[PDB]
Symmetry: C2
Subunit: 59 residues, 2 copies
């Protein structure tokens, strides 16, 4: 099929995994948020959360 | 660009919940446009980048 990002997402839907993958992303974000508010986040988790925020939203 | 400083400032300012809500809104929107088939190329790519930054990084 087409060589683009849409093709992957249509394959993923045919695989029945779209809700699943978004749930995993949502679980990771929740975990990062809790660790940051708790003060237990590692350096790599602070970095990961910063990068995710900046990819989703302006600043 | 220091990620600890980034989050410390947000946390001290009381904005951590707000930033994560905004990310969650973007995710829910992307997910729905992918399932509706209304997403653009850039949105399919953005969704994929978020998935990989959340699930491959620090896995």
């Amino acid at each position: 099929k087409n060589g683009d990002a849409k093709t992957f997402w249509m394959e993923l839907e045919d695989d029945g995994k779209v809700d699943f993958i978004f749930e995993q992303v949502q679980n990771v974000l929740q975990s990062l948020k809790q660790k940051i508010k708790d003060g237990s986040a590692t350096n790599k988790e602070y970095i990961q959360a910063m990068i995710l925020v900046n990819e989703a939203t302006i600043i």
